[PDB]
Design a protein around this ligand. Sequence first.
Ligand SMILES: Nc1ncnc2c1ncn2[C@@H]1O[C@H](COP(=O)(O)OP(=O)(O)NP(=O)(O)O)[C@@H](O)[C@H]1O
Ligand SMILES: Nc1ncnc2c1ncn2[C@@H]1O[C@H](COP(=O)(O)OP(=O)(O)NP(=O)(O)O)[C@@H](O)[C@H]1O
Ligand SMILES: [Mg+2]
Ligand SMILES: [Mg+2]
Ligand SMILES: [Mg+2]
Ligand SMILES: [Mg+2]
Lengths: 214, 214
Amino acid sequence: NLYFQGMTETFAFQAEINQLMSLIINTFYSNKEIFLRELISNASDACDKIRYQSLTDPSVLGESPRLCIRVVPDKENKTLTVEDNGIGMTKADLVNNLGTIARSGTKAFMEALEAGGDMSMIGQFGVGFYSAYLVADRVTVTSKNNSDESYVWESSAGGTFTITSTPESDMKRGTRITLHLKEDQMEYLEPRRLKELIKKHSEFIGYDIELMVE
Amino acid sequence: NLYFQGMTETFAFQAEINQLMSLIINTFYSNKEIFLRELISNASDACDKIRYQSLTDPSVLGESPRLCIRVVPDKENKTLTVEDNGIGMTKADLVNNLGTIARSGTKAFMEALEAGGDMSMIGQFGVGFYSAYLVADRVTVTSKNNSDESYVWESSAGGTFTITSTPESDMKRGTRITLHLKEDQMEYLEPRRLKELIKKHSEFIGYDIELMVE
Ligand SMILES: Nc1ncnc2c1ncn2[C@@H]1O[C@H](COP(=O)(O)OP(=O)(O)NP(=O)(O)O)[C@@H](O)[C@H]1O
Ligand SMILES: Nc1ncnc2c1ncn2[C@@H]1O[C@H](COP(=O)(O)OP(=O)(O)NP(=O)(O)O)[C@@H](O)[C@H]1O
Ligand SMILES: [Mg+2]
Ligand SMILES: [Mg+2]
Ligand SMILES: [Mg+2]
Ligand SMILES: [Mg+2]
């Protein structure tokens, strides 16, 4: 116990979610940039949730009351990160909401694509997050909700994901989604590509989005 | 939860135990065969403990009342295994007894070796198990005690060990110690080497020891 350093639990994906991930991670698609819109939307949604809570109980904001979104390329590590200081996800949120519960939208989306529907429709089917696998071969979600400890969710779409906990874990409310970019997707590490992509959706989002240039 | 597949926890070694493992795993020594005596002794001790319990409560033996020890080389995987159906180790036994508690024997043994004492004295200092690192670069201990679930302890002597649990875990009371043999220690995979080594200590042990020839 005094010698404990941390724990990793492994979970299977719900069956349809697994099938959707395999579909997305393997598919050719000519418009893979929509992943960024999906991650920014989730960040903005998470900021809404804590913002609304803070309107009745301001103390939920703790020492981080300025709600915003950051986009962070890392050429050395070949990762792109979207971070927010929104509501964050409990352990239960991570397991339930990112893999083990499927709604009818999951199956419908695959049926829609099999019928020549558009991958860019992914958000309309309730599975927007999984668009990250268009451009990435591994995704890591680090999240902290006021009600729980910090956890790291991780998956390379092999049918399972892990949830990792460490006894001193980071204390900052929010979520960081980090994408390990596929060989041919190095263009999303380029600040010029990112800055226009952000501007393209920035119009629709009521929180500052800062691009961190290395 | 219904999707849970298992968990791995990581622990630091007690400081002196870590130092002893580094000493043992790195050291030249001309008589490394004593590791086998140490593992067979532990197996025989574990069989004594359940045997004695069964004398007042025979039902502790369940469906495995014949107490014995097996030695199992595996040339394909380059592993040597010593298995018993003795008392087994609870989760707490594995963490407490194989890494996080040091007695004064640990420090004394290193002081003894620094003074030109013998590595073969290891058993007299209460640290016999760690002799496995003379011949192996990783050790895995799978154990099941009547009072607990099955767990796997694992370490390559890098300062930590892991404890792994799976929700359907094996049900057989006992312990299997598996050694991944170092490059130059392939001779302990040879049945002729093993059979004499066993015979050399078989005289001192009141349980059958069977060598499993591939
Ligand atoms: N940055 C984040 N902060 C907090 N929760 C998040 C974040 N990203 C994802 N989630 C949670 O994960 C769930 C899955 O996200 P996602 O697959 O994008 O679905 P969605 O946003 O609910 N609907 P849609 O994106 O329109 O298909 C969300 O409902 C949130 O509960
Ligand atoms: N096969 C096994 N079955 C059950 N418990 C075991 C087994 N091997 C090791 N142990 C436990 O691990 C502890 C450490 O073993 P070891 O380092 O060999 O010390 P020891 O046998 O107590 N004394 P010694 O070997 O004379 O130095 C033991 O006391 C047992 O509690
Ligand atoms: Mg979304
Ligand atoms: Mg934690
Ligand atoms: Mg011993
Ligand atoms: Mg178990």
